[PDB]
């Protein structure tokens, strides 16, 4: 945000937000924040709220400091999830419909469920056959121990 | 020319019966044009 | 159009619904007594619907006086000519026209019309007539 | 096989033309109306259709009114008249 | 070093060619000359009445079953099935306007006049103040900017035209068409809209 | 429903005057009853509960149904998509 | 029947100048003027004056009332100026040369007026200036006389052409120009296709003109309002600060036209026109910017976007604002295939429902008086309180929803599901549906509406359900078939035993089941595959679709008994009786799909018991 | 498919074809029974 | 050059759909096709051909 | 290329609506089956009628 007093709380407010804030109004470099939280409070003659997804543990605040300028880091560790995006390289896209339990997933002769099922159809149509090829080397040089 | 009545019309082909009063059946003739638009040697 | 909306309805409906000679009138009148753009157009149309739906409707006093005063009107003569002669054939004639002299009476303009476009030969009939 | 992870969930409404032309197929009439009202630029109608839907038109879309002011603005009087059905009282809609 | 020359031997462009009419040949070829050959026949063999009543009718039906075979020629080539009455309404759109001859003046049709197949047959039927008029086929894009509503119109393409032409004329627009009461959010008088629910 | 929504229209001369007859009479129940048709129970599925009721057949009002096997007020049925 | 007439006129026109005042009713505006540099205030009189246009901060009427603009010289309308065919052209009968250099080219035009008395043998449009006219004329009949009759003489610029519009006699113009254009039919052919090039385009132009005359006269519309005395400003709202910069160049080039007429014996013509040539460029490009010779160019070389553009193209306020909204109650987001669903229904999550169902959530609370108002409500909805969800998920059911594909494809492209709730932050969609809306998972996004109103929902139910929409309209075939894996399992099923040599090594030279359920189980206990033969009993009547053969072999026993082997099945008939057993060769998958379908109808039926 | 090219050849397909007809070749004057028109305009 | 090659590429895509019939009818490439599952003749030819 | 093809066609057409039940004609398309096999296959023939 770029800038007015930045202030360490605004009145009419409780301790759902202003919890993090710090003497001068920035966050605290560590505290875990979630969707609406105020990250620096500001009085204008204005403030910051972390948006919707935005989540997870500041990181890092900058003071700059001739209006002053806040930059606050927050650090989101996005595992996989549906909806996600995962592709090959040969062009083989996909999203992510379902998560199963390893119990249930298709396993191999060894005993090993595999980790993801793809539709074979998807290669007559695209006609994309080097996934084929690395699909099973991929195998080879994981027991062969090769790359 | 600025409407149609049931009989000169015909059968719907989505009812399987006599078309109903108030169909908007002339945007129904330009989607069935339309939506096959993207559809469209040895001598 | 509150008139031709009413038309429709019944003209493009069941067989006890389909207009006569009254209704044909009205509608005809709606449009030549009309106080906006010109209507002479639609006149003509909905005349040539009634002559087409000979066999069902036939013209009447009412009907020529309205073609007459509608083609006087708009300075087309040699139609409103032939409606004129077909008026002739009914006793009542001239005095339908008339109108008791209301709605700008269309029988002098008849007559004028006649004078100004020169055919004496048929205001000498009109006269007749009268 | 070697799977990428894509940008797509981390980097990241309006109805279309098009859309009107479907809804106008299946005959919504009220549907197609209600998109082109409170459920958007129309400030009347969406005041208070918060509180009819939290308790439990008659006037032309903004959209309207402002496409009226711009022929407006070009010497172009656009009237919107409801002559009765009833008696043939024209009157003239405030756009 | 030398240079030979040999001989070696349509989709939607086809479709829009034959649908925007830009020229009577670019469908058929063919049509023309029927047409042409009934343009200067015709008028002469019949009398006024009927001399451009069906004439005119024989260049609208010959045109019809000319384009829905064009049209369907395209659709049924690439394997497209497509019911005739989705065709022969836009068809019947095209095929609909007949142009007044410039030797027909009158109070009631001036030359150079767009009307109706049915205005001109019942006109011509009753009046004899010189109907003289010629079946005109109209291009998707010229037929939806000639119509009973300038909104439609001008909304279409050509706003600042249309709108600066039905200016002049005061134009009266009964929004009895659909687009038309999309603009201004009115109820369509369609589907559930039609008539008035009741 | 489904089968019952069919069921008057095959008994119906215009889909769309259906509709609107259907949206008219809900209009009317839920003016009478304003605090009825929220939750559970729909005004336009009591319309089409009733309409099937009035031909002589038998539906729950309004289609609604509960969950017996509901462990508790706070558990709310997950649906395995 | 009586139809419900509902009759709706929608006119257009020109304005008068007198209802252009009747707009700004007082709202002159002479400063060309807007907000304030530094105390941010709208100026007296300016682009924004709060007086003129209504308050500022009710505030909504700035959207909607309007001023105007007070020309001290008339302007044309270059949209019946400029743009060919000229309307004013056609109507005046003069060439549209002679009208751009009268407007543009400071020419004079003689005889504008005649309703008045003249004294003059002056003719029409001289492009030089009258030598006389200047210093003699004026000297003899004095200045102040002088002025009263000189636009009864000779007149410049758009005065001329509105002073002619108002001195023409429409019913006049009909006779002579139908006389003209009957005369030159009346000769027939020339012989040569130029000259007979040039009496088509005059007989046009004759029908044209009495075309235009006609209209006036059964109309109210005045042919002077082509050349407008008064310009209509824009309401602020609709040009928040590109147009304004317009507004405020007319309005000073306007202003110093004042200053060079208000002024004690000004320098007249070449100072005059100098600032009345610009202030009709000025409302040329406000109007119509792409119709000028030399468009106007801002000092960036940016083509002004004039009135005419802002309401032509897909951006101008006529295709995009109308055909299509910015509607509210909608979400976008990444959607998945939920194989599981029914054909009608949609997965939504939790947090995209709870934004649609904003409204419904808090009636239900309010109703069950979880929720004592709607500001508790919502803080209890951002609380995310336990009960919240079971209140939305009351709600939406039996709610449909509209689910519509942005790149919209077909009439499926929008189509309506009952939503129920479902985890995760994606919407779940059935795998049929995804293919009428093409819906590919490589990535889509499609945008969800809640019908409000319970007409809307009422349509959304009983029109849009997937179930009631299963036939294309064009050419009437189902759209819901099933298609990939789909296909491929009911492929696999009905494939099926191995026939011939590719069944037994060596040339010839199988469990019989009493009915349908035993061979089913006995698949599932592994006794038998998938594809192996088995005789099924028939108990029904013929019904195997094959192709019609005679037996290939019929073994007649002497007792009566005969069995008639088919390609497909084998009937035991008898003389002595009429037993008529039929066992049908076939396997699992063909018993599986036939039992699929057969159950599928009679759970329906049994569901939809209307029996009881 | 194709209407002859001859004018009076296509009069015949027109019949055949129930495009038109005598029976639709009537004026205002005939079916009104306007007898005094045809002695007014050929003279 | 152009004909040879053409009337070869032609001739293979005519003959698989019987070879696949009469040796290898259920061959996993051919029922996504020839079921019309997924995929046409002229895209297996590509693969195959 | 196809979707601005849709938007002409549909807004030629845009007005066109089922509102009368018979609007009372009498002339009427006339179709052979005997002069029109030699051209058309006859299962396309079946669905115009």
Redesign the interface.
């Known amino acids: 945000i770029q800038t007015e007093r930045i202030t360490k709380e605004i009145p009419h407010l409780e301790g759902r937000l202003l919890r993090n804030l710090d003497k001068n109004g920035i966050v605290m470099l560590g505290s875990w924040v979630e969707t609406g939280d105020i990250l620096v409070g500001k009085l204008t003659p204005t403030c910051l709220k972390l948006p919707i997804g935005g989540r997870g543990r500041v990181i890092d605040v900058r003071w700059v400091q001739n209006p002053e300028i806040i930059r606050v880091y927050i650090s989101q560790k996005r595992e996989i999830k549906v909806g996600d995006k995962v592709a090959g390289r040969h062009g083989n896209k996909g999203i992510i419909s379902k998560i199963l339990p390893r119990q249930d997933m298709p396993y191999l002769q060894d005993g090993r469920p595999v980790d993801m099922v793809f539709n074979p159809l998807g290669v007559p149509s695209r006609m994309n056959v080097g996934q084929i090829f690395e699909c099973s080397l991929g195998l080879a040089g994981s027991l062969l121990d090769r790359h | 020319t600025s409407w149609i009545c049931r009989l000169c019309y015909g059968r719907s082909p989505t009812h399987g019966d006599l078309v109903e009063l108030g169909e908007a059946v002339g945007i129904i003739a330009g989607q069935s044009i339309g939506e096959p638009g993207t559809q469209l040697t040895g001598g | 159009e509150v008139a031709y909306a009413t038309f429709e309805n019944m003209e493009y409906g069941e067989d006890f619904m389909k207009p006569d000679t009254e209704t044909y009138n009205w509608v005809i009148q709606a449009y030549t007594r009309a106080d906006s753009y010109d209507r002479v157009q639609d006149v003509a149309e909905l005349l040539g619907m009634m002559v087409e739906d000979y066999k069902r409707v036939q013209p009447n006093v009412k009907t020529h006086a309205l073609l007459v005063e509608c083609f006087t009107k708009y300075c087309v003569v040699k139609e409103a000519i032939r409606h004129f002669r077909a008026l002739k054939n009914f006793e009542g004639g001239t005095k339908v026209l008339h109108n008791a002299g209301n709605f700008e009476d269309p029988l002098s303009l008849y007559l004028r019309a006649l004078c100004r476009e020169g055919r004496i030969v048929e205001l000498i009939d009109a006269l007749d007539a009268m | 096989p070697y799977i990428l992870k894509l940008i797509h969930q981390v980097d990241d409404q309006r109805v279309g033309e098009m859309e009107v032309w479907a809804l106008e197929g299946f005959g919504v009439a009220h549907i197609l109306q209600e998109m082109l009202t409170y459920k958007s630029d129309h400030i009347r109608a969406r005041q208070e259709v918060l509180g009819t839907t939290i308790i439990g038109p008659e006037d032309a879309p903004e959209s309207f009114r402002l496409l009226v002011r711009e022929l407006r603005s070009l010497a172009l009087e656009l009237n919107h008249f409801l002559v009765s059905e009833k008696n043939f009282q024209i009157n003239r809609k405030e756009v | 070093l030398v240079t030979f020359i040999y001989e070696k031997s349509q989709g939607l462009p086809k479709v829009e060619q034959v649908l925007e009419v830009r020229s009577i040949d670019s469908i058929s070829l063919n049509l023309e000359k029927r047409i042409k050959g009934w343009n200067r026949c015709i008028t002469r063999i019949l009398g006024i009445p009927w001399g451009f009543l069906i004439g005119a009718e024989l260049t609208i039906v010959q045109s019809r079953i000319s384009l829905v075979n064009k049209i369907q020629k395209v659709y049924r080539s690439q394997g497209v099935q497509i019911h005739n009455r989705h065709i022969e309404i836009i068809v019947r759109q095209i095929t609909s306007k007949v142009l007044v001859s410039e030797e027909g003046m009158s109070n009631v049709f001036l030359p150079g006049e767009l009307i109706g197949l049915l205005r001109a047959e019942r006109t011509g039927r009753a009046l004899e103040e010189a109907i003289c008029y010629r079946a005109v086929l109209l291009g998707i894009t010229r037929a939806s900017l000639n119509t009973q509503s300038f909104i439609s119109e001008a909304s279409f393409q050509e706003t600042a035209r249309v709108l600066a032409k039905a200016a002049l004329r005061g134009r009266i627009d009964w929004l009895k068409g659909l687009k038309e009461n999309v603009v201004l959010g009115g109820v369509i008088p369609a589907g559930t809209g039609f008539n008035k629910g009741l | 429903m489904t089968m019952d929504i069919e069921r008057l229209l095959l008994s119906e001369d215009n889909r769309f005057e259906f509709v609107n007859s259907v949206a008219a009479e809900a209009t009317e129940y839920v003016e009478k009853n304003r605090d009825e048709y929220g939750g559970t129970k729909k005004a336009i599925f009591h319309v089409l509960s009733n309409r099937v009721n009035d031909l002589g057949f038998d539906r729950p009002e309004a289609y609604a149904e509960s969950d017996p096997y509901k462990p508790g007020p706070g558990y709310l049925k997950e649906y395995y998509t | 029947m009586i139809d419900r007439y509902k009759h709706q006129q929608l006119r257009i026109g020109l304005v008068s100048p007198q209802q252009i005042s009747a707009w700004a009713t007082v709202g002159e505006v002479t400063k060309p003027y807007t907000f304030h540099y530094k105390t941010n205030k709208p100026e007296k009189d300016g682009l924004f004056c709060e007086r003129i246009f209504g308050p500022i901060k009710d505030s909504r009427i700035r959207r909607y009332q309007m001023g105007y603009i007070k020309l001290t010289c008339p302007v044309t309308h270059v949209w019946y100026l400029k743009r060919l065919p000229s309307y004013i052209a056609n109507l005046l009968d003069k060439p549209l040369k002679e009208l751009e250099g009268l407007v543009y080219c400071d020419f004079s035009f003689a005889r504008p007026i005649t309703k008045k008395p003249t004294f003059l043998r002056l003719r029409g449009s001289f492009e030089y200036e009258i030598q006389s006219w200047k210093y003699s004329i004026p000297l003899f009949f004095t200045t102040q006389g002088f002025e009263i009759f000189r636009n009864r003489e000779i007149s410049t610029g758009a005065g001329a052409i509105r002073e002619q519009l108002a001195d023409l006699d429409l019913r006049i113009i009909i006779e002579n120009s139908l006389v003209e254009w009957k005369q030159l039919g009346e000769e027939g052919p020339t012989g040569n296709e130029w000259e007979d090039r040039k009496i088509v385009r005059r007989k046009d132009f004759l029908v044209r003109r009495m075309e235009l005359a006609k209209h006036f006269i059964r109309t109210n519309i005045e042919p002077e309002w082509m050349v407008l005395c008064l310009l209509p400003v824009l309401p602020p709202e609709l040009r928040p600060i590109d147009i304004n910069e317009l507004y405020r160049r007319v309005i000073y080039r306007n202003n110093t036209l004042t200053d060079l007429l208000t002024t004690s014996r000004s320098t007249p013509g070449e100072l005059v026109m100098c600032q009345e040539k610009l202030v009709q460029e000025a409302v040329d490009t406000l109007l119509d910017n792409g119709i000028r010779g030399q468009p106007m160019r801002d000092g960036h070389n940016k083509v002004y976007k004039s009135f005419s553009d802002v309401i032509e193209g897909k951006e101008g306020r006529f295709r995009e604002t109308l055909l299509g909204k910015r509607v509210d109650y909608s979400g976008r987001s990444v959607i998945v295939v939920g194989p599981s669903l029914s054909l009608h229904r949609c997965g939504l999550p939790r947090e995209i429902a709870i934004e649609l169902f904003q409204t419904f959530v808090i009636r239900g609370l309010i109703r069950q008086h979880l929720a004592s108002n709607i500001g508790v409500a919502k803080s209890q909805i951002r609380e995310k309180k336990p009960i919240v969800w079971e209140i939305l998920q009351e709600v939406m059911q039996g709610h449909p929803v509209l689910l519509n594909r942005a790149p919209t494809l077909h009439r499926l492209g929008i189509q309506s599901f009952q939503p129920i709730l479902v985890e995760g932050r994606t919407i779940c969609l059935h795998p049929l549906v995804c293919k009428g809306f093409n819906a590919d998972f490589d990535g889509d996004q499609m945008a969800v509406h809640v019908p409000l109103s319970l007409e809307a929902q009422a349509e959304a139910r009983l029109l849009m359900f997937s179930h009631m929409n299963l036939l294309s309209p064009a050419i009437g075939d189902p759209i819901s078939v099933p298609t990939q894996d789909m296909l491929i399992g009911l492929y696999v099923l009905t494939s099926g035993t191995r026939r011939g040599i590719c069944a037994n090594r060596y040339n010839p030279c199988e469990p019989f089941f009493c009915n349908s359920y035993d061979a089913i189980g006995a698949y599932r206990q592994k006794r038998i595959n998938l594809d192996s033969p088995l005789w099924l009993r028939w108990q029904l009547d013929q019904r195997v679709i094959a192709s019609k053969e005679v037996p290939i072999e019929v073994h007649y026993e002497s007792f009566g008994n005969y069995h008639e082997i088919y390609a497909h099945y084998l009937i035991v008939r008898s003389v002595k009786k009429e037993t008529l057993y039929i066992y049908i060769r076939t396997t699992v998958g063909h018993i599986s799909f036939y039992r699929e379908i057969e159950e599928a109808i009679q759970g329906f039926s049994q569901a939809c018991s209307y029996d009881t | ?3 002859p ?1 001859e ?2 050849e ?2 015949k397909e ?1 019949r055949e ?4 007809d005598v029976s ?5 004057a005939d ?2 029974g ?1 007898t ?2 045809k002695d ?1 305009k050929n003279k | 050059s152009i004909e040879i090659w053409y009337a070869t590429s032609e001739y293979l895509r005519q003959e698989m759909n019987p070879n696949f019939r009469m040796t290898d009818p259920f061959n996993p490439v051919h029922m996504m096709s020839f079921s019309g599952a997924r995929g046409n003749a002229s895209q297996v030819h590509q693969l195959v051909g | 290329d196809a979707g601005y093809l849709t938007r002409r066609l549909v807004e030629v057409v845009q007005h066109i609506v089922v509102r009368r039940t018979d609007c009372g004609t009498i002339r009427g398309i006339s179709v052979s089956p005997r002069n029109k096999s030699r051209m058309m296959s006859e299962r396309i023939f079946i669905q115009t009628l």
């Open positions: 498919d194709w209407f090219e004018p009076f296509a009069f027109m074809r129930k495009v038109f639709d070749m009537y004026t205002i079916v009104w306007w005094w028109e007014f």
